[PDB]
Amino acid sequence: VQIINKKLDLSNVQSKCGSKDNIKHVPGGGSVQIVYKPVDLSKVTSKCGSLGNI
Amino acid sequence: VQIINKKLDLSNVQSKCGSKDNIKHVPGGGSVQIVYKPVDLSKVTSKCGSLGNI
Amino acid sequence: VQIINKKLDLSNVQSKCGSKDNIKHVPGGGSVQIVYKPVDLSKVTSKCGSLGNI
Amino acid sequence: VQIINKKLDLSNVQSKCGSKDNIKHVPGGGSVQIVYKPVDLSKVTSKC
Amino acid sequence: VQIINKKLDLSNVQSKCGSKDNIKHVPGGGSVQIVYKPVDLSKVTSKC
Amino acid sequence: VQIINKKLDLSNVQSKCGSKDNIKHVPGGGSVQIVYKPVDLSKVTSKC
């Protein structure tokens, strides 16, 4: 047996925001789950001369 | 047995936002699940001279 | 046995937004699931001189 | 407004097994996923 | 507004097993995932 | 506004086991995940 795994991210990013998840990885049944009026009001501005590799 | 796996991302991104997911990976039955009035009002602006590789 | 797998993303993107998913990967039966009045009012602007590879 | 989610379990069961599941709810791609020789040899018996 | 989530369990069960599950709710991709020879040999018995 | 989450367990059970699960709620990608020869040999018995 030989197992090889390779996961590669070589991103260039000017503005990056992580996720906004409310009720996540919550096992077991028999419950009341309410996500009530979640709101995103956010403002993102990105301004650039150049971004990739040269 | 030989197993080779390769996942590759070479992205260039100006503005990046992760997901906005409400009730996610919630196993087990017998429940009340409500997502009530989720709202996105967000503003994203991107402005650029060049973006890819040169 | 030889297994080779390869997933490749070479994207250039000015503005990128992830998912907006309300009730996702929620197994087990016998439940009441409501997604009630989800709204997207968000505004995206992208403006560019050039974007691909040169 | 009424939301009622209701269960009455009055069952008679010898064995209740909810699942025997190998690769369940696995979102991302770009993966090698192998389920190799899953076996069920379980025995459920009543004698009287 | 009423939300009622309600279980009555009056069951008679010899064996209750909620699951026997190997790789489960695993979001990330770019992975090697192997379930190799899972076996159930369990014995549930009534004599009378 | 009423939210009621309610359980009436009046069950009779000989053996109750919530789960027998190996790799469970594991968000990270780029991983190697092997479940190798999980065996259930459990014995549940009534004699009368």
Resolution in A: 2.3
Contacts of F29 in chain B (CB under 8 A): 7
E6 close contact with A: CB closer than 8 A? no
- HSE-CB for A39 with a 13 A CA cutoff: 3
Instruction: Name beta bridge partners: D12.
Output: E12
Q: Which of F1, F2, F10, F24 to mutate to test the interface with E (most CBs of E within 10 A)?
A: F24
Experimental method: cryo-EM
Give the tokens for residue D2: 């009424």
- Do F and C touch, counting CB pairs below 8 Å (3 needed)? no
C19 close contact with A: CB closer than 8 A? no
C-alpha–C-alpha distance, residues B33 and C35, integer Å? 8
Q: D47 to chain C, minimum CA–CA distance in Å? A: 33
Q: Write the CA distances from D3 to A51, B27, B32, E20, F8, integer angstroms.
A: 52, 20, 8, 32, 19
Task: Give the residue among A20, A1, A14 at the shortest CA–CA distance from A46.
Answer: A14
Place of tokens 């906004």: A20
Q: D32 to chain B, minimum CA–CA distance in Å? A: 7
> Could you write out the DSSP letters of every residue in C1-29?
-EEEEEEEE--EEEEEE----SEES---S
Which residues contact residue B47 at a Cβ distance below 8 angstroms, ignoring those fewer than 6 apart? A46, A47, A48, C47, C48
Run of H or E including B50:
none
CA E31 to chain centre: 24
F28 close contact with D: CB closer than 8 A? no
Residue type, C45: T
C42 close contact with A: CB closer than 8 A? yes
